[PDB]
Ligand binder design. Structure first.
Ligand SMILES: CNS(=O)(=O)c1ccc2c(c1)CCN2C(=O)c1ccccc1F
Ligand SMILES: CNS(=O)(=O)c1ccc2c(c1)CCN2C(=O)c1ccccc1F
Ligand SMILES: C=C(NCc1c(COP(=O)(O)O)cnc(C)c1O)C(=O)O
Ligand SMILES: C=C(NCc1c(COP(=O)(O)O)cnc(C)c1O)C(=O)O
Ligand SMILES: [K+]
Ligand SMILES: [K+]
Ligand SMILES: [K+]
Ligand SMILES: [K+]
Ligand SMILES: [K+]
Lengths: 249, 404, 405, 249
């Protein structure tokens, strides 16, 4: 009927604000510390937690996340740690999605991973290197286990591919990226009413406020990793600032 | 012969074998606009007579095609008295098969109005060929190369720089071919609107596996004509080394529909397939999505890429092209491992018997051809793709044989 | 058919232009038995269709002949808008024209029952080629090379050793080509009973000037056909670099009887012909007996050999082949100097304009062609012999252009 | 007519001995010292002195003579110093022939050099890299200026070339060359009566006496340079021993 994240964006619209979507990679600086950090995100005001699966060759990630996931892998992080992190977030009262490259899912098994993500309490999957053209098995698994499917659109996306990508998404659309970020959101808003999350290297409360003026969600990741590296108290403070920034709308 | 397609082509999405799903485009949406742009440009220019005329003119007068086919009679005693024929791609301009693919893609890059060409390189032969065509056509060029490969293939680094191409050393990961591909990928994502990615092997997302193979098909088409003219029949076997798969698919393709012709690809086994220091993708890998395609790769139980190891820079890659994964599933091609020691022995043997210094990549094929000659016996005709010459490997080989 | 003993061949004594003219045999009597035996063997096999078939078979399938002819359109503006055509001997197996002569001579050595082959080398291309044929044909191989050349052409030293040849670093005199020739010579006089001397240039005593030139004639024969196909006429000029003279005579010969075709050979001028650090044998030399022939050489007032200097190991030679002396005296070929700086300028221009890394030897011929193009003007057709590729010179070129430090 | 060296070999034959032919290079260790050594050879019993012209590229010389000629050339030795050495040997009562590679003669001028050599008292010319096939100019100047012409024969010489080389020589034939030397002398004796000198790396009286059994002249060069390098008294002693060896009684 409705997307798993539907009610979350509904509660944010009623409060005249954007959702705060925070990303952290599993296993950095270790598995127990990362879960304590993700719990702190729920406590510090994150509406949605993106739980990242560390991957050996993360071509789409910047240096901050790429080096943290690399350190996580040096520590022996496993994919099952991500499912254990989703369960801890759900128990703490948070709303967790998983962000992963596609080969770890293929290796696990798309259906088996969807089933196990659903059973852990996960609400959706973000697939930065899976386009709808290859998403046949994922679409079936997304519907069977009632999981949202968050694809990415790009500023360079052709109008035909933007439409097909938006049509294939459930929950929200990840507008990955000047003036290109509002324009990309507008191109999505022209063909659908699905929520639009925006990632834009957000570091400050003001940046979250700016994006909240046109986006349904504000995605922060690299800055959260940087804060956790300084320490868990630094992550709490920054997440609070960003939580206030999304209410500026 | 690029104007006419083949019965072995993938669907519009780049999938081989229907339900098996080999190939495809496992890429971010951020690359799909340029990926569709290259695909459309290639379908337009492959039937354009002006394009075909430019490519043929360069292959003949610039690259030196056709390359000859040479019966290495002094190897026969070391190959069970079989008859080893060397397809002499080592004699192409720049010294390997890579120039075939690069001339096609470089001409395409100019047709698309791209102002900048990037490429990865492992052995440095694709890097030199790319630098070569960008000098010739007047295009900005940047080559990404793993830091370990810049050290063991230093001759080709200096060739690239003399040719006016920028060379970026890649220090991430295993500092070899797969890491160069990662870095060049990131460049393409950021600069797609004006940058052409001249990919050097028969892998990646559609259209690269098919386009690279189409530009390399000239090898096997020549070889099929040359072997019949010299030997009076089709070969019993055609063999090649397999890194990503471009020189192998290039010489295999013309023989796919010849049922009596055995096709054998030889992949790098490094220190041995049981040591965890190898690059034997088919022997020890499994299916997965990697570098834009669904194919085989060396991966652990969670799907993390396992780093490869080989004395040969050009085969030191944990993946393989999707058309090969399809051909292996169909049973049309067999893929076998060849170790560092086997390759180096064949290297020295080819030096002393035939006066040919091969690339260490190509020495894996010679090594496997020697074993296949013993298997097939006296009088068997075996065509071997001698993919490159070994000037880049002379230091490594002299150190291996104590000649310093 | 077969190119019969045409009107350009010397007499039975090896003399060009008269019985006491250029060439001959200025050798000790201790070598005359093996020199006459090689001369008889060559006279027999040069008219044998089975020998020419063996050579042709190796040239086609093993060496990659024919080599293409490539119009380097992106050089034109630097050559007064002339049209530069490159004869791509750089694409031959081992990377130079030297393999043409070596295949002929190694087949001959095998026909004579010799089991040991010796040779000199300067750039290392003739040494690699000789070592290549000896491996191919199962002959023992010893290459003499000057100690200075083993340092600046170290890539070819290792290639030779991988091919199973013994490389002997020569420390006498200038430690370059002329001194490697002296040492290989001493080897021959001691082992004249079983060793064949595979000489790598169109010089030395008869029959080497004629035999080497005959094995390299295939270059000009192909080029004369190719240029008429591509430009629709005979060239206005054919140019090559001149060390001992093999690659130049190889491409010149097919054109000797085409009176409208200018022929220009370019020799190494090093730092400059006025500095005394050069190898400009025709520009600054004089006739004399040297290395078994009467020809031009750089010599002082007493007849002592003046040591040569060039950034190019293959042109760093104070002599020149006797047939070139005859063509110069006859006025059929002009010989002009090209400095290190001019050659390296042309080296780098060929790299970045055409994507071809030439031998530094060959860069001298390209540099002369650029100058010649300015003299001849727009539309002039100039065929250039690109004698070799520059893999051996990559380190030298990298230093020259600041790619090191 | 008779050869310039004919009386010498006649006199040695009349005394049941071989001629002692001694070689020294001009200018080693310097021009005055080499002239003193060549004079010492005359005083110590040498019948014929070979005056060597140092050459830049002496491919036929062993390392002992090659190093000495290199040193002489570093010292600035000129071809004209060889002519002066001949004068001094003539003045001392000796008999001198010049041994030289052919190019310094060509640079000097063949007729001019033959004229000046005969004027200085020279009796002949040994031409190690001039075969009779190229000796047309030298044959004319040799007859005009009454100089002997000593060509070389080798163990490898064909019967035709050995006969033609002997027929072309005047004075003596140089049998350059472990029994190859006496049978090479025998091949020359079979076709002509001309005196035959043998070079064989003579280092001792014993070796000189071995050669004197079948040869008309014993040629010594490398050992004289080695002796001179040690000192002029060592040269006189060695030459005395060698003059004893060539005498049979
Ligand atoms: C882990 N998933 S990823 O970072 O998004 C990702 C996806 C795709 C690819 C890469 C990373 C690197 C290579 N790659 C390609 O597509 C590719 C291969 C050969 C030639 C051109 C290409 F574009
Ligand atoms: C100074 N006079 S010399 O030492 O006797 C003398 C005479 C002749 C020759 C040499 C020295 C060295 C080279 N040379 C040759 O003939 C020759 C050249 C190329 C190939 C083969 C050769 F045999
Ligand atoms: C890695 C590249 N070379 C691989 C290579 C290979 C293996 O690549 P294929 O794409 O499998 O043909 C074989 N032979 C030679 C001479 C090679 O250089 C390169 O030059 O970048
Ligand atoms: C000296 C040798 N090379 C000379 C050379 C020359 C000059 O030699 P010629 O005999 O004049 O062709 C030209 N081009 C190349 C590529 C060469 O290598 C040698 O390799 O021994
Ligand atoms: K990510
Ligand atoms: K370029
Ligand atoms: K055959
Ligand atoms: K793959
Ligand atoms: K010269």
């Amino acid at each position: 009927e409705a997307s798993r994240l539907g009610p979350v964006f509904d509660s944010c619209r009623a409060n005249n604000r954007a959702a705060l979507i925070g990303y952290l990679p599993t296993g950095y600086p270790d598995v127990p510390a990362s879960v304590a950090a993700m719990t702190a995100l729920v406590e510090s005001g994150c509406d949605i937690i993106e739980v990242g699966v560390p991957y050996s060759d993360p071509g789409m990630d910047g240096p901050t996340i790429a080096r943290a996931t690399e350190a996580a892998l040096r520590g022996g992080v496993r994919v099952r740690d991500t499912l254990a992190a989703v369960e801890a977030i759900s128990i703490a009262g948070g709303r967790a999605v998983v962000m992963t490259y596609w080969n770890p899912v293929l290796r696990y098994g798309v259906d088996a991973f969807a089933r196990d993500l659903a059973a852990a309490g996960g609400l959706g999957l973000i697939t930065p290197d899976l386009i709808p053209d290859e998403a046949q098995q994922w679409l079936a698994a997304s519907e069977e286990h009632r999981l949202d499917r968050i694809f990415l659109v790009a500023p360079s996306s052709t109008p035909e591919r933007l439409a097909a990508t938006v049509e294939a998404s459930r929950g929200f659309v990840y507008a990955a990226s000047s003036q290109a970020a509002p324009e990309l959101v507008g191109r999505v808003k022209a063909v659908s009413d699905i929520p639009v999350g925006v990632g834009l290297g957000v570091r400050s409360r003001a940046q979250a406020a700016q994006i909240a003026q046109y986006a349904d969600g504000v995605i922060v990741g690299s800055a959260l990793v940087t804060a956790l590296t300084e320490g868990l108290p630094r992550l709490r403070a920054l997440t609070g600032e960003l939580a206030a920034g999304v209410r500026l709308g | 012969a690029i104007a006419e397609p083949t019965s072995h082509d993938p669907d519009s999405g780049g999938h081989f074998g229907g339900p098996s799903g080999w190939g495809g485009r496992y890429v971010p949406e951020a690359l799909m606009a340029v990926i569709e742009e290259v695909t459309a440009a290639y379908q337009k220019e492959r039937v354009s007579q002006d394009f075909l005329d430019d490519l043929d003119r360069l292959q003949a007068n610039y690259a030196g095609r056709p390359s000859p086919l040479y019966e290495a009679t002094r190897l026969s005693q070391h190959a069970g008295s079989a008859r080893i024929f060397l397809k002499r791609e080592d004699l192409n301009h720049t010294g390997s098969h890579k120039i075939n693919n690069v001339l096609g893609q470089a001409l395409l890059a100019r047709r698309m109005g791209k102002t900048r060409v990037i490429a990865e390189t492992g052995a440095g032969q694709h890097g030199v060929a790319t630098a070569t065509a960008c000098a010739l056509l007047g295009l900005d060029c940047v080559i990404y190369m793993g830091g370990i490969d810049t050290a063991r293939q230093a001759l080709n680094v200096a060739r690239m720089r003399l040719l006016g191409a920028e060379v970026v050393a890649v220090q991430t990961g295993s500092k070899t071919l797969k890491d160069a591909i990662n870095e060049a990928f990131r460049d393409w994502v950021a600069n797609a609107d004006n940058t052409y990615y001249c990919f050097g092997t028969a892998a990646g997302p559609h259209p690269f596996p098919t386009m690279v193979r189409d530009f390399q098909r000239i090898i096997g088409m020549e070889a099929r004509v040359q072997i019949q003219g010299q030997a009076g029949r089709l070969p019993d076997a055609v063999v090649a080394c397999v890194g990503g798969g471009s020189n192998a698919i290039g010489i295999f393709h013309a023989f796919l529909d010849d049922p009596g012709v055995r096709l054998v690809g030889f992949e790098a086994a490094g220190d041995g397939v049981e040591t965890g220091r190898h690059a034997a993708t088919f022997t020890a890998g499994s299916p997965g999505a990697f570098h834009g395609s669904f194919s085989y790769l060396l991966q652990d139980e969670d799907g993390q890429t396992i780093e490869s190891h080989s004395i040969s820079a050009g085969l030191d890659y944990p993946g393989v092209g999707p058309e090969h994964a399809w051909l292996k599933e169909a049973g049309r091609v067999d893929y076998r491992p060849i170790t560092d020691s086997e390759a180096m022995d064949a290297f020295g043997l080819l030096c002393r018997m035939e006066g040919i210094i091969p690339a260490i990549e190509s020495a894996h094929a010679v090594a496997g051809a020697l074993k296949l000659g013993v298997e097939l016996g006296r009088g068997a005709v075996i065509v071997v793709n001698l993919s490159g010459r070994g000037d880049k490997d002379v230091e490594t080989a002299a150190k291996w044989f104590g000649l310093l």
